[PDB]
Amino acid sequence: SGEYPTVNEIPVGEVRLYQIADGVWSHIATQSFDGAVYPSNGLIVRDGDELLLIDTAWGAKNTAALLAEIEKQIGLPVTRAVSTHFHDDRVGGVDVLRAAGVATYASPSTRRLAEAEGNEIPTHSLEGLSSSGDAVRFGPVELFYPGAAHSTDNLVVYVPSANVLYGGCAVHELSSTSAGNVADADLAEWPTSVERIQKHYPEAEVVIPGHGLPGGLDLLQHTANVVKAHKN
């Protein structure tokens, strides 16, 4: 009923949308992994009379439900999608997207890691993102590679028209007391990567984590703190 939707409020297989700003929504879904249930976020950005999707809804059936929710709530076609790293909460569902006619994109690093992992593989490579601090435009957003953090390939997304920073899994929510799934993370580089984000997007008004509740710029420093404390 208007609050940001939480893990216990979303059955696995359902998807919710949350309006962030004019023309900007997050999508929220839940999935089971290794016997626990987690929420995860993605982004939707209006692109004229089309939509740009950032990240799948973590699985094929969730992603079909995402497309149905978008049609219900927004009614514009998703024409392109970007996955912000290689894990299943970002690329699981790419096959559903592709079969629905959505053009799917990721960095070459993400595509290689997804392939090697046995995850679904976005179709098109996003060049110009291989060095930390790189940025490229993609429709109504900027894609930024901050350096290794949650994963070596993680990208962040900025919506300049709305000052919305989507951190993906490189950014944690404020209630987080752990660094999440660190299997593929670089804990030593993560704080430096966050500092690059902070320097590059000082006017961000909303920061959206990969999992959990949006907030303001404090999520960035909070993430650096949680990661340093995990590493310690």
Asked if 88 is part of the footprint of Zn ion (rule: CB under 5 A), the reply reads no
Q: Residue 38 binds what, of Zn ion, ligand X78, none (CB under 5 to 8 Å, by partner type)?
A: ligand X78
CB–CB of 211/180 below 8 Å? yes
CB–CB of 154/134 below 8 Å? no
How far apart are alpha carbons 165 and 210 in whole angstroms? 11
Instruction: Figure out which of the listed residues 132, 181, 198, 225 binds ligand X78, where binding follows CB under 6 A.
Output: 181
Angle at 91 between CA 97 and CA 137, to 5 degrees: 85
Q: Which is nearer to ligand X78, 181 or 192 (CB)?
A: 181
27 is annotated as an active-site residue: no
Contacts of 34 (CB under 8 A, 6+ apart): none
Write the interaction track for Zn ion spanning residues 102-141; mark x where CB under 5 A is met and - where it is not.
----------------------------------------
232 is annotated as an active-site residue: no
Write the interaction track for ligand X78 spanning residues 30-69; mark x where CB under 6 A is met and - where it is not.
---x----x-------------------------------
85 is annotated as an active-site residue: yes
State yes or no: 150 annotated in a binding site: yes
Angle at 126 between CA 155 and CA 94, to 5 degrees: 80
- How many separate helices (H) and strands (E) can be counted in the chain? 6, 12
Q: Which range in 30-38, 55-63, 185-193, 208-216 contacts Zn ion by CB under 5 A?
A: 208-216
Q: Residue 88 binds what, of ligand X78, Zn ion, none (CB under 5 to 8 Å, by partner type)?
A: ligand X78
Q: Which is nearer to ligand X78, 47 or 89 (CB)?
A: 89
CB–CB of 162/24 below 8 Å? yes
Q: Which of 109, 122, 72, 134 is nearest to 184 (CA)?
A: 109
State yes or no: 172 annotated in a binding site: no
How far apart are alpha carbons 144 and 147 in whole angstroms? 9
Residue 177 CB-density burial (10 A; 0-12 exposed, 13-18 middle, 19+ buried) = exposed
Residues with active-site annotation = 85, 87, 89, 150, 181
Residues annotated within the binding site for Zn(2+) are: 85, 87, 89, 125, 127, 150, 169, 211
* Contact residues: ligand X78, CB under 6 A: 33, 38, 87-89, 150, 169, 178, 180-181, 210-211
